[PDB]
Amino acid sequence: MKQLEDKVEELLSKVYHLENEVARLKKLFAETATKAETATKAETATKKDIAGMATKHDIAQLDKRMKQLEWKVEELLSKVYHLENEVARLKK
Amino acid sequence: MKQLEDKVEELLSKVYHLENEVARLKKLFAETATKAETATKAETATKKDIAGMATKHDIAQLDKRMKQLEWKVEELLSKVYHLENEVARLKK
Amino acid sequence: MKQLEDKVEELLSKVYHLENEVARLKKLFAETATKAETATKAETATKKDIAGMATKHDIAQLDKRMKQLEWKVEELLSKVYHLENEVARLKKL
């Protein structure tokens, strides 16, 4: 009977330890992220991958310059056409 | 003996609870994501970071326009070279 | 008493199993990721989203070409201005 009495005492401590350990795990699991809600390394773009990313302002800077050239080229077409007539007129 | 009998009954319920609690944690852990497979907030680019991203079609749009200008500039070179000769011829 | 003796034996094995099961979970939790440190699917850009990303070298390539055109257009302006004076001069004298 004293053998059984001790066993019970051993079980009590063991159960008590388990209770504590499970409680911890309960708390700790609260802070963990689910597979559903989180994104994998394989399917996500790192900050490394976008280090050499072009902005919409870089492109805007180029658009600006393109427009300026486009405008200058139009003016030149106008000037050249006029000169062709002027030279033609001179030849007659 | 009735004291020990009750203790055993108390342990039984406690063990039963723990069994359930651990099973839950087993299940719940199944849906959690590992550190290895998931990507950290620090090393991943958010949708905010890529809000002002330039596309390859923005650039294609610019390339198109560049090619058009390139053609117009060639034509102009041709027209101007001819005019220079025509004017030179007129001066002699 | 032998009924109680057996119950205790049943509890011992069950406790022993639980001890092992909890230890595993302890270990396994060590390799799991926290909500704080990880990034959600909703707030992160996938490799799909950046498949059509423009580089800074693409842009550099365009800048190079733009500069070449810019130079040619300046030269043309110069050539045309000179011709206008030359033709004007021809019309007067």
Distance CA C14, CA B44 (A): 44
Residue B14 CB-half CA count within 13 A: 20
Count of alpha carbons within 13 Å of B37, Cβ hemisphere only? Answer: 12
What is the experimental resolution, given in Å to one decimal place?
2.7
Chains with at least 3 CB pairs less than 8 angstroms from chain C: A, B
With tokens 């393109």, the residue in question is: A66
Find the CB nearest C79 among B42, B59, B80: B80
Neighbors of chain A by Cβ distance (3+ pairs < 8 Å): B, C
Chain C closest-CA separation from residue A35 CA (Å): 10
Nearest to A44 by CA among C52, B44, C42, B53: B44
Rounded Cα distance between A36 and A44, Å, is: 14
HEC secondary structure over chain A: CHHHHHHHHHHHHHHHHHHHHHHHHHHHHHCECECCCECECCCECECCCCCCECEHHHHHHHHHHHHHHHHHHHHHHHHHHHHHHHHHHHHC
Residue B49 three-state SS? coil
Q: How far is CA B11 from CA A3, A79, C3, C7, C13, in A?
A: 17, 102, 15, 10, 13
Q: Which tokens is A49 given? A: 């991958």
Of A11, A33, A39, the CB nearest to C15: A11
Six-digit token pair at C90?
A: 């021809």
Residues of A in contact with C47 (CB under 8 A): 43-45, 49
Nearest-angstrom CA–CA distance, C68 and C45? 36
Residue B76 is encoded by which pair of tokens?
Answer: 């102009």
Residue B38 to residue A38: CA distance in whole angstroms:
7
Q: Residue A40: CA atoms inside 13 Å, Cβ hemisphere, count?
A: 6
**Quick count: other Cβ atoms within 10 Å of Cβ B40?**
17
Q: How far is A71 from chain C (nearest CA, A)?
A: 11
Q: Does B30 touch chain C (CB under 8 A)?
A: no
How far apart are the C-alpha atoms of C78 and B86, rounded to whole Å?
A: 17
Q: Which helix (H) or strand (E) holds C27?
A: helix C2-30
Q: Where are the domains of chain A?
A: 1-35, 52-92
CA angle B7, B9, B12 (to 5 degrees): 110
C32 to chain B, closest Cα gap in Å: 4
* Distance of alpha carbon B75 from alpha carbon A70, whole angstroms: 14
Residues of A in contact with B59 (CB under 8 A): 54, 59
CA distance B90 to A31: 88
What sign has the CA pseudo-torsion C55, C61, C64, C69? negative
The Cβ-side half-sphere exposure at C8, using a 13 Å CA radius, reads 21
